[PDB]
């Protein structure tokens, strides 16, 4: 249950059209909004942090628990322009944590290639307007149901078994190439799942050992609001009115994460954010949202 | 060239309705309207039409609401038309939208209030639709203003109007009734809620085609849960098997009159327009339920009718939410037996435990580390055991 921040670097327009900078990074846990708000996090990355730093200072430590039998949940919180996709997918020179995770996992596979009778596989889909579509193969809406042991199985979701680092990025690219176009749409969420089946050296080759699962989620642009002029929307509003004020930071995503918001989970959310005053309003709310999470 | 103006306009109008399919060129049409405006500047009606044009320009000025200049046009239009048809409240409502983007809820609210008042001061199809749309917009506002009560009122009004016209779809009505009854639960006005789901139940006579029935059943259960809470106003733990130790008056004429005074409004809420109010009368047989005492058999029966509907949901769900719903139902039936405060009747208490035994197997199924889920189910067994603790 951790919350971290990635403050992005300023762009040409921001430097040309000198916008006053609002976000000030102070240290690992502290940054100041404008308001002069000393927001406190579990880790804050500044405008120049590398992909390796982001991975090594987050996911790498997290993987220590993953390998120990924990399930993980990753929430790339942010708005359009946050750098969320670059952070996860990344560029060739600066590939994101998804790539790095898999490459690191190849290392982890090597670490237990002798030790354990393990196997791995991966899956990946898009959530768009609460609709679920497999991005590893062209499919329709997937059926999220519980399996023979109550696991939240996204029925119809494929499961792949790559070996090389080329496949890692190649397939990550292929998957992101299948995402809905707005440039990737601001309303698209990416959901990956890492399946770690493993069996301890001293345990029987047919010994029942739980599978560790890591969910990687690229959240859609976070950017109380006027509702759409529709009867269905009115019904939804009625439902909202009927609902008790949970007041939690908090969909099909929660269905997907039903058992991944529970115990034995390593949940982490990152707020990739903009430093410019142009986005001041959203930034304030984002940082306060992060406080809701904390 | 007014005829040619409206001619072009109407073409543009159709086009305004039309890989972007709008905005790109819609804006061009916007400007074409301004060109059509040009010629205009009797004349009193011209000015009305001017407001209409500028209104149309405001309407055109959207582009994902980027074109704030429309706001300026609309304000002028208002002034032009305040001297004195219904499209003008549409405009006011549109200004409200703009304020919602600017977060100016109060002014938007004021517009909506006057939109309503005006029509009422006044006293064949557009309005019929628009009017209800307005009520919805108010509900949106009320959400933001937490005017839940007022919103609910409007909700009923829209339900009415949907019923007045052919805005029908059973699933929608189901969830409408569902949330409405929940509202009433939230506001403890159970007595009004009574006809709501049950009215929807009537509607169901004309996928979720069958699967929605569990949602419906859940709500029927909710009735009972709160009806049992009504019974628990004289908390069973605090009283014996007897009741009306409190005032009796369960159907006191006094209360009937009180309820009738309230029913001056609730009967208005009964939107069965005679025909379906007669259907509602068949429903009223169920609505008659208020605060029953020696009716645990009937109470259970009320459950059983919808229990069987519930059992279809046990079928529809793949052994997961089956138990989430069973969980509730077991307690529900057991609570009827809490009300059936007799040492001679504990067989049902056993039967509810038997269902929990059926719900035991799922705890070996759930291999996910759902400790608290599992514990909750263990608590359900504790509860069953508590039935017996009370018997012993
Ligand atoms: N958090 C960031 N870190 C580094 N560079 C960033 C960051 N945010 C924005 N930039 C860069 O500028 C562009 C804006 O990020 P962007 O891709 O728009 O986020 P997204 O596309 O998911 O909305 C990207 O190419 C990104 O690499
Ligand atoms: Mg992206």
Describe what you observe in this structure.
The complex is a heterodimer of chains A (294) and B (392). Chain A has nine helices and 13 strands. Chain A is α/β, with parallel strands linked by helices and 294 residues long. Chain A has one domain (2-111, 120-193, 215-223, 251-293): Kinesin, CATH 3.40.850. Chain A has an eight-stranded mixed beta sheet, sandwiched between helices. The longest helix of chain A has 15 residues, at 97-111. Chain B has a domain at 207-250 and 290-392. The longest helix of chain B is centred in the C-terminal third of the chain and has 21 residues, at 296-316. In chain B, 74% of the residues lie in helices and 0% in strands. In chain B, helix 1 packs antiparallel against helix 2 (26-37) and helix 7 packs antiparallel against helix 8. The interface between A and B is medium-sized, with 28 and 39 residues. The complex binds adenosine-5'-diphosphate and magnesium ion. The site of magnesium ion has 3 residues of chain A, from helix 4. Chain B: Interacts with KIF1B; positively regulates KIF1B microtubule motor activity. Interacts with STMN2. Chain B: One of its GO terms (molecular function) is protein sequestering activity. Chain B: Belongs to the KIF-binding protein family. Chain B: One of its GO terms (biological process) is in utero embryonic development.
Give me some keywords for this one.
heterodimer, A: 294 residues, alpha/beta, Kinesin, 13 strands, globular, B: 392 residues, mainly alpha, 19 helices, 74% helix, 0% strand, elongated, binds adenosine-5'-diphosphate, binds magnesium ion, Kinesin-like protein KIF18A (chain A), developmental protein (chain B)
